[PDB]
């Protein structure tokens, strides 16, 4: 059930061709989503960004792999939505895959892998440790990147 | 553009966050926009803005301002925007802002204002926007507001206003937007809104309104009206008579109980109508005139019938949600050409006619779960278009139509236990996700489509036993056990002599084992009959009485064998004591009665799952040992704990008798052969019972995971392995059987 | 982490001060929180007891909006009239070109 | 080597949510590309569009699933670039995958599947027959669609389970043989 996440970087050469650098990662397919292979453009989403019910502000194109870094639970005493609800909302907004950084919220794996009778059609992956910090650095340093979740 | 103030060529000066304690100096005399927000100016001295005659926009946000001199803003005759939010002002500076004859936008939010002087806002004849929210106001400043006839937008949210008096807004004819959310408003007088003929947006969310605000009838130009998160319970008839131009009404999160029948009639511009929890409503709302509805939602009510002309009136209806009601008969949905999503779950629909869903060319998602549907017309889905999601789960279905279903992506039928037939896989070309009451219906679709429940190893599709090696092993066990058990039974019970307890117990274990042999024979015969086509037979076998009979036979045989072994070992130990204790054992009748009691206990143990439902139907093998259930786990853990306690009891009894046994006493005594035979029997039985026990204990430990085929194979190969093994030891290792067979041969030859 | 109560390096601010606005800034592929005393252009402040949040001006043809459906000023070529942007002043109202809105 | 292709159609709701309709398809992974899984926006693409070496007119974003419809070789007596060259050029232009429609030219199947020592890092799929015409209809009828090529690893890995089954069968047979040898040894000793 392990997931291999590949991060790709572009540089549009003047002649027109593309050269790619790939960086490896490792996550785990959460039980909240199917264990399929997905791919798309990485778009970080704030944990509070999935709260809003007015999606007209952030109409994204279909097929964006969302990266959400969960924060420590005491900093959010009252949540608007559970992690499953946040993932389902992201899938509603056109995300082809959802990646959660659960380093600061070790219970997220618990409420994700928990027995749910309504699995999501798209994969849900969580990362932690060196992989999570590497992915977050890639997110907050490079201008654009594309993720390739494989099974 | 003197330092530290940033300055561009558009006469706009920015000095935010420079830590100034007073207004900056040395700036251009032609400055038009000055921004000194985020600074530390805690007081504005007199005539502090006498160097900017041409100022137009001024910002003082986040300055911790506390006192403004009355002459501080003197000479600002061209000021248009003045912001003073996020400060420490406690009273509105009426004296200071009196001279701003050209002000158009004033901000006073995020302050600690408690009282507005009666003479405030005098001279602000050009004011258009006023911010007053997030303050400590306790009442509407009627008189100060009366001096602003040109006001267009006013906000008073996040305050401590309790009620609105009559004619609180008699002036302010040009008002358009009024905000009052997150207040403590509980009472609105009848003529509180009189004079607001131009008002379009009224906000009253998060308040304490108990009754409906009848005063809104004096707002002919209302377009949006939100009072959600309130305490409104009853909406009377003709509540929105005075607002014919309504577009959206926010009324969710309310303790709604009853809604007037004619409350939402006319209202030709209303777009969405969502009412939940109106449990005292019995009739469908009278929506005549309302032709602009694009979404309807009436859940949690007692509505029983849908009017026929619903599709004729609401031409532009898009989504229709009518769950949690008492709807019995569905009308003709013909004419709802724009309908996309229909939700009707948790209702009392008992049938679907041919013409129910005729003309829904744009239908995409249809929900009918948790109803009483017992019959669906074969052509009921002939006229559907791009239908992607269908849900008929938890119903009384017996057969499912398939015509016109080629476009489906997701289909749900879980809970239709009466649905035994198999769905044809050729009518669901585009299906991707499926749910069925029984996993055996999923066999056809898989092309080895995420369908549930998964057809795991414990629920095979093609072959019941599986691998040819396992099939051969089970066949061999069956034949060996059957033949050897008949041989042993005939030999032991073919002599009309007094039967000692040892021989009687050996024969009793043999006849008990015969039933496990019969169970294995049933398994092999069922597998042979259903070779390759077990999917068809699986549902009939599991739900039928055959699985119950096989499971009862298996459980009864196992438990009777175990209890018989217990009683045999106890008898052996007692007789070993009696050998030098009395020299004669006289417990024949008592031991026979105890054996009968053990047999009856085995019968009751086998019959226990029969009263329960689903215990024997977990697997086609009909064994209680599950893949994980909540009741079956309890039954299996009870049974296996009893068996393990039995095993340790016999083990400790045997060790005790061995310790009390003298080494030289086994040289030539006849009972030595019998005690060695019993030792070997308990040896093999205890060894072969461990794997089943440990695999039944496996799901209780989450750290270890085993693929289903492993436990399936080991249970098929190990549960009846003692069955074939037990008589082999007696026939090939007990010298007494030689004399017994000779006596039987002599009897046969004599007869 | 300016004017912030709980800040992180990846998500920026997660909870602003009491009387401050929490605005989510979209910077290409990276999104993070921010606290401002007033919502930026194209957004309107919405006061609330648990947190104040910026929201996009949903009124079409608008630059700065007082509320969800009230525009203080539209872009060039459009006329202010009761918080609505009109390419031409309706009947009974004459355009004013100097400061760009409808007048009587 | 079977390839499963899903074609997704978007419908942006006014609220901001997305509604999807997926159409199934089946192709075959060619030996000229890896048997991975890919996904990206579908971009129709003329066979002669790769002939030009001026890429400035074809600056697409990275990660687009290319769809190429071949034609009869008669009308193209001199193909400037072979099919493998076209796949390589498309990949160089940032295509995450290439889906060929080889129904018109069946020789492209053996041209892609011929023994070559230069496989491409991105999958190359070929489709033919009714599947090809269906995919062509979707691509030239709908405006924008997203393809999801799934490798779909083959039938369940029953290797280790089969070894366990043979282990159990061998254990049973060895036990039977041991019992038989013990019994004949005891018979000889008693005799
Ligand atoms: C603002 O000015 C006051 C009054 O002089 C002073 O006590 C306070 O420290 C200042 N705050 C700053 C510089 O942040
Ligand atoms: C406000 O309305 C009242 C009642 O009609 C009127 O007497 C008063 O003059 C009005 N005030 C202004 C400033 O227009
Ligand atoms: C429904 O509304 C129409 C139009 O207002 C009215 O004529 C009719 O009497 C109403 N019907 C009921 C049953 O209230
Ligand atoms: C709605 O009110 C108008 C007058 O404003 C009237 O002509 C019309 O009949 C009414 N319609 C309904 C359905 O009540």
Residue numbers in the entry:
A (entry chain D): 57 to 207
B (entry chain A): 29 to 476, 520 to 822
C (entry chain C): 40 to 143
D (entry chain B): 57 to 247
How is this structure described in the published paper?
Leucine-rich repeat-containing G protein-coupled receptor 4 (LGR4) plays a critical role in regulating the wingless-related integration site (Wnt) signaling pathway and is essential for organ development and carcinogenesis. LGR4, along with its ligand R-spondin (RSPO), potentiates Wnt/β-catenin signaling by recruiting its signaling suppressor, E3 ligase Zinc and Ring Finger 3 (ZNRF3), and inducing its membrane clearance. Cell surface-expressed LGR4/5, members of the class A G-protein coupled receptors (GPCR) family, have an extracellular domain (ECD) comprising 17 leucine-rich repeats (LRRs), followed by a seven-transmembrane domain (TMD), and an intracellular domain (ICD). ZNRF3/RNF43, LGR4, and RSPO form a ternary complex on the cell surface, which relieves ZNRF3/RNF43-mediated suppression of Wnt/β-catenin signaling and thereby potentiates pathway activation.
We purified LMNG/CHS detergent-solubilized ternary complexes of human LGR4, RSPO2, and ZNRF3 (residues 56-267, ECD-TMD) from Expi293F cells cotransfected with LGR4, RSPO2, and ZNRF3. Cryo-EM analysis of this sample revealed two distinct LGR4–RSPO2–ZNRF3 complexes with stoichiometric ratios of 1:1:2 and 2:2:2, corresponding to a heterotetramer and a heterohexamer, respectively. We obtained cryo-EM maps of LGR4-RSPO2-ZNRF31:1:2 heterotetramer and LGR4-RSPO2-ZNRF32:2:2 heterohexamer to resolutions of 3.2 Å and 3.5 Å, respectively. In the LGR4-RSPO2-ZNRF31:1:2 complex, RSPO2 was bound to one protomer of the ZNRF3 dimer through which LGR4 was associated, forming a 1:1:1 complex on one side of the structure. No apparent interactions occurred between the ECDs of ZNRF3 and LGR4 in the 1:1:1 assembly. However, ZNRF3 made contact with LGR4*, thereby stabilizing the overall complex, particularly ZNRF3 dimerization. At the center of the interface, ZNRF3 Y77 and T78 formed hydrogen bonds with G435 and N437 of LGR4*, respectively. In addition, two pairs of electrostatically complementary residues (E67 of ZNRF3 and R392 of LGR4* and E62 of ZNRF3 and R460 of LGR4*) located at the peripheral regions of the interface might support this interaction. In the LGR4-RSPO2-ZNRF31:1:2 structure, the TM helix of only one protomer, ZNRF3*, was defined by the cryo-EM density, whereas that of the other protomer, ZNRF3, was not visible, indicating that the TM helices of ZNRF3 are flexible. The observed TM helix of ZNRF3* was aligned and in contact with TM1 and TM7 of LGR4 on the extracellular side of the membrane but made no contact on the intracellular side.
